[PDB]
Amino acid sequence: MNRIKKVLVANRGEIAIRVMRACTELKIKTVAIYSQEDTGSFHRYKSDEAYLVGAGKKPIDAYLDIENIIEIAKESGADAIHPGYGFLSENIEFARRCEQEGIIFVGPKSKHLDMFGDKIKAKEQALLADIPVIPGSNGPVAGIKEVEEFGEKNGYPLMIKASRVVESKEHVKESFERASSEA
Amino acid sequence: QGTVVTPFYDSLLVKLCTWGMTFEQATRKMRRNLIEFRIRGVKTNIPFLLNVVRHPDFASGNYNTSFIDTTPELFKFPHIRDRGTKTLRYIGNVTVNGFPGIKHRDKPVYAEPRLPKIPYGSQISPGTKQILDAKGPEGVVDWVKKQEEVLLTDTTLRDAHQSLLATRVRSKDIFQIADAMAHLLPNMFSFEMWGGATFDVAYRFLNEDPWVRLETLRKQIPNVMFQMLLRGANAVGYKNYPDNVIREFVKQSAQSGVDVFRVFDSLNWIKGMEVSIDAVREAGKIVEAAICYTGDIDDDTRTKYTIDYYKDMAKELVAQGTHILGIKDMAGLLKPQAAYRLIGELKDTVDVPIHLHTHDTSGNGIYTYAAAVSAGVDIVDVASSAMSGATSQPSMTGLYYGLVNGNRQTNLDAQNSQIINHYWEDVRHYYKDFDNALNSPQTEVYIHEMPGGQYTNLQQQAIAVGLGDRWDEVKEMYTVVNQMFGDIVKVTPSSKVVGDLALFMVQNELSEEDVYPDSVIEFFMGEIGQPYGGFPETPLTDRPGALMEPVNFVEVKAELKEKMGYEPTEKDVISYILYPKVFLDYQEMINKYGDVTVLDTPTFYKGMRLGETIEVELEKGKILLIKLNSIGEPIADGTRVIYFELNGQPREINIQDMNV
Amino acid sequence: EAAICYTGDIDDDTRTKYTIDYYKDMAKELVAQGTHILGIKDMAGLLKPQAAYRLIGELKDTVDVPIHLHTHDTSGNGIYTYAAAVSAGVDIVDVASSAMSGATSQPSMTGLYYGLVNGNRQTNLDAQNSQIINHYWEDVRHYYKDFDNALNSPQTEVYIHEMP
Amino acid sequence: QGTVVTPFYDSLLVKLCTWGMTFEQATRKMRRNLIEFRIRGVKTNIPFLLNVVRHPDFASGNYNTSFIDTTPELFKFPHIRDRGTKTLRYIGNVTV
């Protein structure tokens, strides 16, 4: 193993552990991070070192304290950071912020997360690659019930997606108000 | 988890297989897995398998039946300490047997100490250290002389707790506040944080390394200068030593962070001090040769210790060379009227700045300082309100509010010093077991002239002897014993000598007239040094320090390495030389329980309550969550199993009960 | 002994209401109302020693009566606040046996004597005597440990909250 | 064994994967494993997974997104025999 001597695992639970296992298999030191509610989770005991992160923060917010994590990463001597999945796995700001501090980020370049950040900019990126796609709105369907016109042209049944299902007609009303609110 | 292994059938617990696209890949996974396994309750062959799997000939894939046996290394196993288990041993032990020296009592629910909040990135305001760093000792002494105000030295980390709490304050509790001390007390002349009894007590009673305490602080507080107290003759030692160890000690201390060295001899004999004072000049650091105060200057009945005598002695110490002249009033004898006279008369006699140390036993502590400030003295010793008073120094915050609108003053943010106090107010409760100090003005002090430390230490011996009922008789006999050797400066280790005999005479009902112990013969030998009067009643003749021949550092350094588990650092060696019996004892104890410095004080002294959970930080980022669930019942030989959860994982350890 | 209770800070002018003039004035009217002696009851321990030097000297000027001072050692500046008064020439002060002095009590009698012992002005009391009396009280106070809830170090916070 | 599940984070205790030369072989191993698991102190989704893995349309390997929901049976679960606990209830009762 070459330029990564030590790695921070910016996640919890099953996925955190898998990463640690990988590192240790590769003679790479590992650092864990746990929220206040996760002082108990045995992912923190499976690392070579561990620090509390989301101090005073709401439990989910705790693993997203980007800035805190970098300070922890820097203080630890961590050559790189693995965000696992969920949490900051796809967060651009964090991805970028690693590159800014010269911490290696285990995953794609932030430009890649940017293009795929929203579902729309990816579906867009899909046509540019010239591959099959679902027929849909050429932008985000910003108009409410602009669908029925778009719906009239294509199909009886339609699905609505954000960055719920419809059989057309009256349902269109009921689905959007909750879909966009859920989003 | 539950299973018990019988010996009847074969030994196998679990078969562990790993797979990879390449055998080199599989070997990696096997390695990780073997380490990852946690099995406790029984020995296993894992450490053996690890050695065979780690072995490079195994990874090559070329081996034969004769591969084992031919290779003996595999049978050598790493001597692994688990800091964790040893920590539970300590905690479990004190939980059932109690801490030595104190009534076994339940661990209270101490209030959480109030820590000062610091805004992020704030301050770092430069201190007096900078001026030593920049312009050496002389450049400081200059800046001193220039200041119209009165300058303060904070003894909160020494003497204050040495007097009040038997020097038992632990590094863990000190470090916690040190950050705020740098931010909030920057304008202090110095922080007294090392020396006197702290050195031997850390190793003896705390199982902490004093050298660490020093260096850790040094980093936390870069701005303010560090000061210690050094018994010139024997440094911080119990016995006399050859001159090289002393010079070595001081060299190290200066290296580690000590900037100002208050040095005294117990008899006020400048000859005993000579060795160590030169070392500090040679260290290129500040010397505060200090005159220990006894008797009464204003009462002329006594011929021996005249205001002249102190004026004369101060000349000879400026001649011997000292960047500063301090006056160590170790008993609290300097009445405030005498202080006005002494500062004014010594500022006339010599050009050096003056630094005064007094103890508030009398109730006249703050007043004795006001006398000095009126008479224009440069520096004085105070402590945080919550650790001031009694046999301690006077309140820093007390003094400020005392001098607040006078002609001369002391620049400290009142509110700041109070915030620092709030911490100590809360922390002192941890040490109630050691807070045996009397809490009203003990005016009797002037008669017996005995230092605060000595009153309690000698009360103890009389209680030991069973003369507690006759205690009043000892106190008087002591005064006679000083009067038997004329009038002599009573202070450690000379103080001890008086008390040791006083207790003998009163024990055997001998009057001074009736009269016609190793430590006393050594006094009359001259091993403590030379009494100023030189009382009459084989010949020591000269300083014992010089007469000592040096032991080569390397012969010992190797002796220790063989005694200790491994190769020692330079510091470990001096310590061994100075306190050999205790240093090994400290080593043996640290091997058994690991580095205890880290445990929160209550847990250190009181162990754990049932169902309690605590966290301990062994190192940056390495925290043990520890819970005690229940305690096992004793068996035949008194042993009982304590039931823990170290890191959520249940553990079980045996501690031998001492008394049912 | 008509007595004036002390509050606020005479040396600090930020708070004007209780000015050195106002206590000087108020002492006049109490000499007018007639009082064999004028005492100053500092019930909290607020009279800083520098302010005491000023106040005794300024009231000895203002009125011909003898002066009597009561202070509490909560601050740690109890004995010093007296020394200021004795320097400024006050006639009478309140003290207690060492064993019952300090803290929220008066300063030690035996403490004060040994404080002023060879100064310009003094107090004539047999030191040894006062100590013998003290030995009793030393021993007796233990009976009352249940009620000895007082804090036994200088509580400097007192100036802020001013409480008794 | 010791762990407590908080509700703050997701519900996952352990990821169980099984392999076979043929998917029919892997399904068997999954079945056995799911049954073999003994977890007590909390409810789990095992009985659900069992019903989906037992279902013959799953073993076929021809299913679609609409396979669940369309099939309600999977949500009907066999009553739990806990003969053992009830036995201790009796024993404990008459004992006190």
Q: D10 and A13 in contact by Cβ < 8 A? A: yes
| Structure tokens given for B335 | 């009445």
Which of A26, A39, A50 is opposite residue B621, by nearest beta carbon?
A50
Inter-chain contact B443–C114, Cβ cutoff 8 Å? yes
d(CA A64, CA A72): 13
Longest dimension (CA), chain D: 57
B623, β-bridge pairs: B617
C9: left (phi over 0), alpha (psi -120 to 50) or beta: beta
Interchain touch D–B (≥3 Cβ pairs closer than 8 Å): yes
Instruction: Please check whether residue D4 touches A, CB under 8 A.
Output: yes
Sheet holding A80-82, edge to edge: A49-52, A29-34, A6-9, A80-82, A104-105
Place of tokens 């000023």: C54
**Least CB–CB distance from B622: residue in A39, A40, A49:** A49
Determine whether the interchain pair D9/A59 forms a contact, defined as Cβ–Cβ distance below 8 Å. yes
Q: Do chains C and B touch (3 or more CB pairs under 8 A)?
A: yes
Amino acid at C64: D
Residues facing residue C96 across a β-bridge: C108
For D4, the closest chain A residue by CA position comes to A40
CB within 8 Å: A50 and B649: no
Choose among A24, A31, A76: nearest Cβ to B32: A24
Q: Tell me, which fold does domain B435-541 have in CATH?
A: Cyclin A; domain 1 (1.10.472)
What would the two tokens of residue B422 be? 């709030």
Neighbours of chain A (3+ CB pairs under 8 A): B, D
Per the document, the length of chain C is 164
Say if residues B332 and B450 touch (Cβ distance below 8 Å). Answer: no
Angle at B433 between CA B91 and CA B470, to 5 degrees: 135
- A58-84: b or e for each residue (b if 16 or more CB lie within 10 Å)? eeeebbbbbebbbebbeebebbbbbbb
Record the tokens describing residue B519, joined without a space.
């430590």
CA distance A148 to A141: 11
Spell out the residues 6+ positions from residue B34 whose beta carbon is closer than 8 angstroms to its own.
B16, B46, B49, B50, B53
Whether D38 and chain A come into contact, CB under 8 Å, resolves to: no
A vs B: CB pairs below 8 A: 29
Domain B542-577 fold = Arc Repressor Mutant, subunit A (1.10.10)
Contacts of residue B491, Cβ cutoff 8 Å, sequence gap at least 6: B264, B266, B292, B328, B330, B451
Is the Cβ–Cβ distance between B440 and C102 less than 8 Å? yes
User: How many other CB atoms are there within 10 angstroms of residue B522's CB atom?
Assistant: 17
- Token digits of residue A38: 């996760």
Q: Give the whole-angstrom CA distance, residue C88 versus residue C111.
A: 19
Q: What is the DSSP annotation of B534-596? A: --------S-HHHHSPPPPHHHHHHHHHHHSSSPPPHHHHHHHHHSHHHHHHHHHHHHHH--G
Using DSSP, state whether B427 is helix, strand or coil. helix
- Quote the minimal CA–CA distance from B648 to chain D in Å: 6
Domain A135-183 CATH class label: alpha beta
Q: Which residues neighbour B226 within 8 Å (Cβ) at sequence distance 6 or greater?
A: B129, B190, B191, B193, B194, B214, B217, B218, B257, B258, B259, B260
DSSP A133-147: -----SS---SSSHH
Q: What is the resolution of this structure in A?
A: 3.3
Shortest Cα distance, chain A CAs vs residue B233, angstroms: 45
Task: Tell me phi and psi for residue D89, to 5 degrees.
Answer: -60, -50
Residue B469 DSSP code = G
Task: Provide the sign of the torsion angle of the four alpha carbons C10, C15, C21, C26, taken in this order.
Answer: negative
Taking an 8 Å cut-off on Cβ atoms, the answer to whether A25 and B648 are in contact is: no
Contact list in D for residue B645 (CB cut-off 8 A) is: 2
Nearest CA in chain A to B29: A25
CA–CA dist B96, B638 (Å, integer): 11
Residues of A in contact with B31 (CB under 8 A): 25
B264 CB burial (10 A radius; 0-12, 13-18, 19+): buried
Contact B468, B458 (CB under 8 A): no
Query: Is residue B384 within 8 Å of residue B408, measured between CB atoms?
Result: no
**A16 contacts chain D (CB < 8 A):** no
Residues on chain B touching A56 (C-beta within 8 angstroms): none
CB D9 within 8 A of CB A59: yes
Partners of residue C156 in chain B, C-beta under 8 Å: 385, 395, 397-398, 401, 414, 418, 421
Distance from CA of B603 to the nearest CA of D (A): 24
Which residues touch B138 (CB under 8 Å, ≥6 apart)? B323
Q: Is the CB of residue A152 less than 8 Å from the CB of residue A169?
A: no
**Given C50, C79, C101, which is nearest B404 (Cβ)?**
C50
DSSP assignment of chain C: -EEEEP-S-SS--SS-SS-HHHHHHHHHHHHHS--S-EEEEESSS---HHHHHHHHHHHHHH--S-EEEEE-GGGS-HHHHHHHHHHTT-SEE--B-GGG-STTSPPBHHHHHHHHTTSSS-----HHHHHHHHHHHHHHGGGGGGG-----S--TTHHHH---
Task: Report the alpha-carbon distance of residue C113 to residue B443 in Å, rounded.
Answer: 10
> Within a 10 A sphere around the Cβ of C91, how many other Cβ atoms?
16
Cα–Cα–Cα angle for B154, B158, B162, nearest 5°?
135
Chain B CB contacts of D1 under 8 Å are 1
CB B18 within 8 A of CB B35: no
Query: Chain B closest CA to D60's CA: distance in Å?
Result: 30
Identify whether B493 is preceded by a cis peptide bond (ω within 30 of 0).
Answer: yes
Query: Quick one: tokens of C106?
Result: 């008066």
Q: Which residue has the tokens 């500092």?
A: C42
Q: Residue B55: phi, psi to the nearest 5?
A: -60, 130
Is A14 in Cβ contact with D9 (below 8 Å)? Answer: no
C interface test, pick of B396, B404, B440 with most C CB neighbours within 10 Å: B440
Largest CA distance in chain C: 47
Residue A60 contacts D, CB cutoff 8 Å = yes
The CATH superfamily label for domain B130-434 reads: Aldolase class I (3.20.20.70)
| Cβ atoms of A59 and A37 closer than 8 Å | yes
Residues of A in contact with D14 (CB under 8 A): 14
Comparing CB atoms, the residue among A13, A42, A60 nearest residue D12 is A13
Q: Cα Rg for chain B, rounded, in angstroms?
A: 29
The β-bridge relationship of strands B639-646 and B622-631 is: antiparallel
DSSP assignment of B339-379, as one string? HHHHHHHHHHH--S-EEEEE-GGGS-HHHHHHHHHHTT-SE
> Does B29 reach chain A within 8 Å, measured CB to CB?
yes
Q: How far is C105 from chain B (nearest CA, A)?
A: 10
B82 at A interface, C-beta within 8 A? no
Contact A25 B32 (CB under 8 A): yes
Write out the residues of chain D at the interface with chain B, using a CB-CB cutoff of 8 A: 1-3
Residue B505: its H or E element? helix B494-507
Q: Where are the domains of chain A?
A: 1-134, 135-183
Which chain D residue shows the shortest CA-CA distance from B645? D2
CA–CA distances in Å: residue D70 to residues C50, D50, D64, D65, D66: 92, 17, 10, 10, 6
Task: Report CB contact under 8 Å: B439, C152.
Answer: yes
Exp. method:
X-ray
Question: Would you tell me how many other CB atoms lie within 10 Å of the CB of residue D2?
Answer: 11
Residue B31 touches partner A, C-beta closer than 8 Å: yes
Residues of chain C in Cβ contact (below 8 Å) with chain B: 11-12, 48-51, 75-77, 79-80, 83, 98-103, 107-108, 110-111, 114-119, 127, 130-131, 134, 152-157, 159
Structure tokens at C138: 């030393």
Domain B78-96+578-660: CATH architecture, name and number where available: Roll (3.10)
Which tokens sit at B159?
């003497």
Strands B260-264 and B226-231: parallel
Interface test with B, best of C156, C157, C162 (most B CBs within 10 A): C156
CA B542 from centroid of its chain's CA atoms: 31
**H or E segment to which residue A101 belongs:** helix A92-101
The answer to whether the beta carbons of residues C73 and C104 sit under 8 Å apart is yes
CATH 3.40.50.20 fits A1-134, yes or no: yes
Report helix, strand or coil for B618.
strand
C-chain residues near B389 (CB < 8 A): 76, 152-154
